[PDB]
Design a protein around this ligand. Structure first.
Ligand SMILES: CCCCCCCC/C=C\CCCCCCCC(=O)O[C@@H](COC(=O)CCCCCCCCCCCCCCC)COP(=O)([O-])OCC[N+](C)(C)C
Ligand SMILES: CCCCCCCC/C=C\CCCCCCCC(=O)O[C@@H](COC(=O)CCCCCCCCCCCCCCC)COP(=O)([O-])OCC[N+](C)(C)C
Ligand SMILES: CCCCCCCCCCCCCCCCCCCC(=O)O[C@H](COC(=O)CCCCCCCCCCCCCC)COP(=O)(O)OCCN
Ligand SMILES: CCCCCCCCCCCCCCCCCCCC(=O)O[C@H](COC(=O)CCCCCCCCCCCCCC)COP(=O)(O)OCCN
Ligand SMILES: CCCCCCCCCCCCCCCCCCCC(=O)O[C@H](COC(=O)CCCCCCCCCCCCCC)COP(=O)(O)OCCN
Ligand SMILES: CCCCCCCC/C=C\CCCCCCCC(=O)OC[C@H](CO)OC(=O)CCCCCCCCCCCCCCC
Ligand SMILES: CCCCCCCC/C=C\CCCCCCCC(=O)OC[C@H](CO)OC(=O)CCCCCCCCCCCCCCC
Ligand SMILES: CCCCCCCC/C=C\CCCCCCCC(=O)OC[C@H](CO)OC(=O)CCCCCCCCCCCCCCC
Ligand SMILES: CC(C)CCC[C@@H](C)[C@H]1CC[C@H]2[C@@H]3CC=C4C[C@@H](OC(=O)CCC(=O)O)CC[C@]4(C)[C@H]3CC[C@]12C
Ligand SMILES: CC(C)CCC[C@@H](C)[C@H]1CC[C@H]2[C@@H]3CC=C4C[C@@H](OC(=O)CCC(=O)O)CC[C@]4(C)[C@H]3CC[C@]12C
Ligand SMILES: [Ca+2]
Ligand SMILES: [Ca+2]
Ligand SMILES: [Zn+2]
Ligand SMILES: [Zn+2]
Ligand SMILES: [Zn+2]
Lengths: 664, 153, 664, 40, 51
């Protein structure tokens, strides 16, 4: 038998106090008034007594939305501490008004009335409290190192984090941004960015800051949604303190704001500047138009070079035409790259016709990269993540040019390639040019963003490359482990190349041999074993060491089971899970990426593709009027868009019953 | 670590099927076992350049069927010097049945098992990692074991 | 401009009729009574007038749960047709009572009050209507061919199917089975089975019959759940009209009823007859006990053979001990099968020691199979789906024995195997024995049901084999297509075996050749190409027919892309989808299969494993009392377990308001 | 005729098939309370 | 809402006809160039009403 008692005892109520609290709960005004008037004279009932749940008479009256009993208790001067917080959390406007006109707590000490109202996101109570001059303390820098911040963190790191989270919950309230904010959209953008940075910094409190940032982004998107005309939309997007605010939204990674259907419609209308009816056209018509504009890109470039002010000179400045011209230029460059591989004994030969036509494109690519670096800046250049591949391409092309020049000025004779040096400059130049061709042909992935059916796919692939990068670390660890083991076991039986059947040593011979004789060769053997191109007889030695052969073959089999069976299916499961997490947001991400791609063609700089590139207070008032209209519409829409309801209904019915019984 | 349990569950059935087919192929092929001297390079087994005697013994049959999962077992091992075409076809069809059961059925089945088991850990992955990392942190809170090897001796 | 009018016009109401209907809707009793009394004299208002929604005054009064206005309208003799159906569908007991005491329709003509009450599954109204002698028409046979059924189907196949579905919805009601049913559990079982058969037969109306059968199964499971003691449970399971009703539930595939935790507890208590505390034991203790009982299975079998009445004679009759003994016997059989492969030039040799010890096991297996066929019957034998593998094993073993006998009595000399005939009886016997060994070793899959961690897995694999069978048809179609094509292209260049390097022809040689020379060899080449064991040089001919070689290689590549890339990943997706559909029900399916496995060991027949096998009205009254208790408990539990509620609240408030205003 | 029957049946079936409800209930209760207090 | 829709259809009320999906009249292009947000919103509202 387990005895049950009250381990943490409290002060029980008397019979009269319990009767008074029950009368307050039932809403009987007459009995409560009589009890108060009698407590004034006899002092037999404590009006500030709690209940077994901790609520007092005032808290019970607030929870039941009984304004009459609330006012009756307030007129008798009951304890009122923290009652405003309970009235605000209950989201009852009349109670808040009555408390503005005049121990254990469910609210933390740092909670203030305005902060709690912002937490509740109730426009009425927030506006009530903002009518009075109320103020939220300013949060310090995300990485602030002042004496006050470190002192508060060392004294109490739980109180400090809780206070910061409460302040950022108050500031991130959509109703508190609709009011008391000069620019709600820019405030929402900055607040979302700062909350994302705090989520990055605060690891434990990450989900809350993430959801607050997402709430701010959704607030900005809904504010943009309330626009009802193109004039208002272009006033919003072009406000600067064109498309300045849209560029700011792109800077703060506001994907929901950018992917707005109206914003995307405006961007598409700007994108097809020359063609007014591109939206309603057949597939064959669009294909023929694109092919015709692409085949005429040198004519358009030359017309822009000669006279920019003409029917053909400024025709390339249109964003879609500019994109088509750049794509056609890159396609011709890749076609010449394909032609390049179509005497070969010359040591350091002069460049051929195809290479002489390739050189202008390489120079134009390098000049365009350095011009983008000089104009846009450094951070914008490194934020692209495609300028890395462009830098690799340009560096490899420059190395190819340098090695070609060196081999031309250091060699004159025509010696057959069979007796050339392994590190001959021509060979290194050819290898670097082949790698550069691979990279240049792979550079066409960035054009999948301009397509409707190839954009979300590319976004999904970019997002799934992160799971592959995560799996690559563990795969490489296992690979290094097994390579070290097999090398340690097999390096004793290394044989010279002359002893091999065809003077060939390694796994790239017809008969593979010395697969695990060195660390590098062991790494390559275990890499090629993933694809099955490593034969099983490589785990063999000429000596009759059957135990060593079996141990090596079993190491090989263990590596096969770990990589091909465990790691590969594990990576498949990882990618399968990661893809479903992008299925929903694929369209918004693609629209943001395509918006960036479109905005990249809106500038006057870089108009000519290679190789032709080497040859005012009314605004603020209009924006404020539009913002006022948007705020009104958004407040109305959000207003238009449990047991407490039934409890309020029961309280009303009981109060009406008691007053009818008293009247009759 | 949580997906290794599904692999351990699949390993039992895979090993049962492997033992079954190994016993069958051994029972069928152990009559045609040839000495190592008769082999082209005095090498007997599946680790030679020309694989031979792949199903001549239970151990060698197990290893041949293990390596057949990764495709490193050539098809001409299901051959005999005699003109027993029926026996050769029956052995090759046992081999093909084992291939279909393991590579096609069992492997995709294991993939589906791991795919289902991963989604069941997606939600609780953070809490499990935080518990494991808490244990790792508490392991370094003690005075014992302060000096790493070889300074501890 | 699109003009909008009333294409299907109706008869509009007058002002007085609309006012009367509005007074009925608002619940004002006085105005409605005055309107009725005035319509009696002046005949100015039609009391049977509809509304723009088709409802009359009586229907409006029923929908608002206004019993006073309902009775007032009934006393004035308003039209009452089909009002009982609306009162039943509304699930208002008082309205049904008032209508029992006394045009367009929302109910089909075949709907009757008792049928609609059964559809609503309302115990109160169903009992009300069953108090009166009410009757549901009997549905005919699922495959009935009488004149009435075919006549009704040919005259109106929509009315007939609807009537059948309504009748089966009425009969499958849990409340209508709680009442008016001698045995609710057996009725639920039979009804679920018949609804499943109808779902199989009625393809268009499949989901409805499936959900009705599932509802009946859940009703039976919940009736079993209401048991509160082991006595009641064993009374239910052992009722026969032991474990007779449990065997009936197993026969009707009642997986939810079988997998009941209490039923499974009783079955486990019966399963561990000898061990009372097997539930609370360590892993090592259970393992040692199982190993000890398995190593002593011949002693237990011999003790049962000599004296069944002893501490060891009847110790094997315990179900768990019997299962352990049979498993140990099969394990020893497989161990001897493994020993079997451990002079060989004898044509038709006599059996060795291992085969002489194997023969008793084979004879015992055959005798056990034929004894199961003779005892259980034919349908039960073919329902197992494992007796197919047992039949294959026994047929192959019998063929092995026959071929061994023939080779022994037809050959005496010792000729080396190299010069033996291709179809020598010894070779066929050895091949059949190897196939039999494969099948016998694969027979251990059926023992995974007895394990907790291996049972649901085996169920999932059995359920995923159906998707593989579905994919096999399309794979074989594509395989046959490409095999026919490659054969048609390549059969001209077939070369003799002597012309081959080692007198070897086919793909099983060291150098593969003639891979697509015949239909059979083409099928095998394309089969082995799935696993990559078919080399690429087989798509080559000695002649310089480069076009033919390229066309054949491209057929091969197309087949590779279709099978390995498309079909294989498609099958992976199929199995991945099919597995999640079994994840939820895996435990119940495993528990049903394990219950069947346990019940298989409850019989006296087949006690000895191979090779030792070849050497009363109180019951119904108790069951009825238990069933009455269960029905009461289930009705109470189901009773314990939208805009119409708010509409009823508003109607009550408005009626009270009007009556208060009239009184004052 | 068949289409008219179908339209009637569909309208009836669709008719047969939040805070504003509670607000309407509270409004009705408050109005009844005020009118009772005024009458008494 | 069937009741209110029928109420308003009792009076002769009329919804403007949407033009062709690929219409190229002067009115459509003028409305699209003047305000492409108001035009799309009006078309969507008309097609929500008709559907
Ligand atoms: C993004 C990351 C950067 C990518 C771009 C890097 C651009 C850098 C370009 C610098 C190229 C310099 C070539 C070496 C010339 C000097 C020389 O003699 O070679 C010596 C060594 O030879 C080598 O080590 C060859 C190195 C080739 C690097 C290939 C990078 C592939 C990137 C793939 C990316 C996927 C020969 O020795 P010896 O003296 O003759 O004796
Ligand atoms: C479940 C489905 C049934 C499965 C069990 C079947 C049992 C049936 C058993 C009957 C076995 C009869 C053997 C033939 C003897 C006659 C003979 O001379 O062979 C002749 C032909 O030879 C053949 O066709 C061999 C056929 C082997 C069948 C193997 C079945 C494998 C089932 C795998 C299942 C997975 C030789 O020709 P000749 O006259 O010498 O010239
Ligand atoms: C001896 C060795 C010889 C080797 C010769 C062959 C070498 C082959 C190398 C192959 C490398 C291929 C890399 C291709 C990556 C494609 C990624 C596609 C998806 C994608 O769009 O990724 C974008 C980044 O681009 C990128 O990921 C660009 C990657 C550049 C890699 C440079 C090094 C290679 C992400 O988009 P985003 O980051 O812009 O979006 C910002 C939103 N906020
Ligand atoms: C002739 C043969 C020659 C063969 C030569 C090569 C042999 C290679 C053998 C490879 C075996 C690799 C085993 C690695 C297992 C890695 C598991 C990673 C996931 C993981 O963290 O598992 C933890 C256990 O660690 C572990 O699973 C440790 C496993 C130790 C295995 C020892 C035998 C090998 C679970 O974490 P936790 O259990 O601590 O969490 C308790 C929470 N309540
Ligand atoms: C020249 C050719 C030489 C070939 C030599 C090698 C031949 C190898 C043949 C391999 C065939 C393997 C078949 C194994 C099937 C395993 C199925 C495991 C899952 C499972 O429990 O299936 C149960 C049926 O058993 C079954 O599926 C038994 C299948 C019997 C197949 C017989 C033919 C082979 C279903 O359980 P259940 O149906 O009892 O559940 C009734 C609930 N209502
Ligand atoms: C991921 C990070 C670590 C993962 C940890 C563990 C993964 C599981 C461990 C894998 C052990 C593989 C053993 C390989 C082996 O013993 O045989 C090679 C050698 C090759 O000669 O073969 C044998 O020694 C006997 C082969 C019998 C069958 C082995 C069955 C092991 C697993 C089979 C299939 C899985 C597909
Ligand atoms: C898991 C536990 C048991 C699973 C049970 C059953 C799995 C399915 C049974 C598999 C039968 C495979 C048959 C292989 C065979 O007959 O040919 C080998 C032999 C090799 O010589 O080829 C043939 O005899 C003719 C080949 C024709 C095509 C066979 C198609 C069978 C399945 C094909 C593809 C599946 C991918
Ligand atoms: C399933 C039922 C039908 C499915 C229907 C269609 C499936 C897709 C059609 C597959 C066409 C495969 C073409 C193979 C081929 O042309 O080359 C073979 C031959 C082999 O000599 O190679 C070529 O002719 C040129 C190869 C260039 C690359 C071909 C790319 C095709 C698909 C590639 C990868 C897919 C992984
Ligand atoms: C696929 C194999 C045969 C290699 C072919 C290389 C190129 C000829 C392909 C590869 C990627 C293709 C590009 C993928 C994406 C687009 C976007 C597309 O733009 C649109 O979708 C129209 C809508 C718009 O951009 O306004 C223009 C064609 C283009 C450049 C494609 C042109 C043809 C490209 C360059
Ligand atoms: C896995 C490789 C090495 C082949 C081994 C073959 C056998 C030695 C294995 C294969 C399947 C195993 C069986 C799988 C299932 C079970 C159920 C198990 O029963 C239980 O789970 C205890 C609970 C109960 O049955 O009451 C008894 C062991 C047994 C027969 C196992 C015994 C060992 C078996 C026969
Ligand atoms: Ca760039
Ligand atoms: Ca059987
Ligand atoms: Zn600070
Ligand atoms: Zn009939
Ligand atoms: Zn128009």
């Amino acid at each position: 038998r387990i005895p049950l008692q009250i381990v943490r005892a409290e002060t029980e109520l008397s019979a009269e106090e319990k009767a008074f609290l029950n009368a307050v709960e039932k809403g009987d005004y007459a009995t409560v008034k009589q009890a108060l008037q009698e407590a004034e004279i006899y002092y037999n009932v404590n009006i500030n007594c709690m209940d077994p749940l901790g609520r007092s008479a005032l808290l019970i009256a607030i929870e039941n939305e009984n304004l009459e009993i609330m006012e009756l208790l307030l007129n008798h001067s009951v304890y009122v501490g923290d009652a405003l917080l309970y009235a605000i959390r209950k989201e009852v406007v009349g109670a808040v008004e009555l408390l503005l006109s005049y121990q254990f707590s469910e609210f933390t000490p740092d909670i203030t009335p305005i902060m709690l109202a912002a937490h509740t996101n109730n426009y009425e109570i927030i506006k009530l409290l903002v009518q009075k001059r109320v103020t939220i303390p300013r949060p310090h820098q995300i990485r602030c190192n002042c004496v006050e911040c470190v002192s508060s963190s060392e004294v109490d790191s739980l109180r400090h984090s809780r206070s910061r989270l409460n302040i950022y919950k108050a500031l991130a309230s959509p109703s508190l941004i609709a009011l008391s904010s000069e620019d709600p959209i820019l405030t929402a953008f900055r607040l979302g960015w700062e909350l994302k940075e705090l989520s990055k910094v605060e690891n434990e409190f990450k989900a809350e800051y993430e959801e607050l940032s997402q709430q701010c982004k959704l607030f900005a998107k809904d504010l943009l949604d309330q626009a009802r005309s193109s004039r208002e939309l272009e006033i919003i997007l072009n406000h600067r303190d064109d498309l300045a605010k849209l560029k700011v939204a792109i800077k703060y990674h506001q994907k929901e704001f950018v992917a707005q259907p109206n914003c995307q419609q405006l961007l598409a209308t700007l994108w097809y500047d020359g063609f007014p009816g591109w939206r309603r056209k057949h597939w064959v018509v669009k294909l023929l138009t694109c092919m015709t504009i692409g085949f005429l890109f040198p004519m358009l470039s030359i017309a822009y070079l000669i006279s920019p002010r003409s029917n053909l000179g400024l025709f390339i400045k249109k964003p879609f035409i500019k994109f088509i011209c750049h794509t056609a230029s890159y396609l011709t460059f890749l076609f010449m790259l394909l032609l390049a591989s179509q005497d070969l004994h010359v040591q350091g030969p002069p460049p051929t016709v195809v290479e002489w036509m390739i050189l202008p494109w390489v120079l134009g690519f390098i000049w365009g990269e350095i011009k983008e670096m000089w104009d846009g800046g450094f951070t914008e250049y490194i934020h692209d993540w495609w300028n890395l591949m462009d830098f690799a391409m340009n560096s490899l092309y420059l190395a190819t040019i340098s090695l070609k020049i060196v081999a031309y000025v250091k060699y004159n004779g025509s010696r057959p390639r069979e007796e050339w040096e392994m590190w001959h400059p021509t060979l290194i130049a050819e290898a670097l040019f082949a790698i550069s061709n691979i990279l240049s042909s792979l550079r066409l992935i960035s054009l999948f963003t301009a397509n409707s059916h190839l954009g979300p796919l590319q976004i999904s692939l970019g997002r799934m490359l992160l799971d592959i990068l995560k799996f690559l670390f563990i795969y490489c660890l296992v690979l290094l482990a097994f390579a070290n083991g097999l090398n340690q076991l097999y390096f004793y039986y290394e044989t010279r190349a002359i002893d091999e059947p065809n003077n060939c040593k390694g796994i790239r011979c017809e008969k593979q041999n010395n697969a695990f004789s060195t660390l590098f060769e062991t790494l390559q053997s275990l890499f090629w074993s993933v694809f099955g191109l490593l034969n099983l007889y490589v785990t063999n030695v000429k000596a009759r060491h059957e135990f060593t052969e079996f141990v090596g073959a079993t190491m090989f089999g263990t590596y096969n089971v770990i990589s091909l069976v465990v790691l590969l299916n594990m990576l498949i499961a990882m990618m399968n899970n990661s893809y479903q997490l992008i299925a929903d947001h694929a369209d918004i991400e693609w629209k943001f990426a395509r918006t960036k791609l479109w905005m990249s063609y809106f500038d006057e700089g870089g108009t000519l593709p290679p190789p032709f590139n080497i040859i005012s207070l009314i605004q603020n008032q209009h924006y404020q009027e539009v913002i006022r209209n948007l705020v009104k519409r958004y407040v109305a829409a959000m207003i238009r868009n449990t047991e407490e309801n039934f409890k309020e209904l029961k309280q009303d019915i009981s109060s009406f019953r008691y007053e009818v019984l008293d009247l009759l």
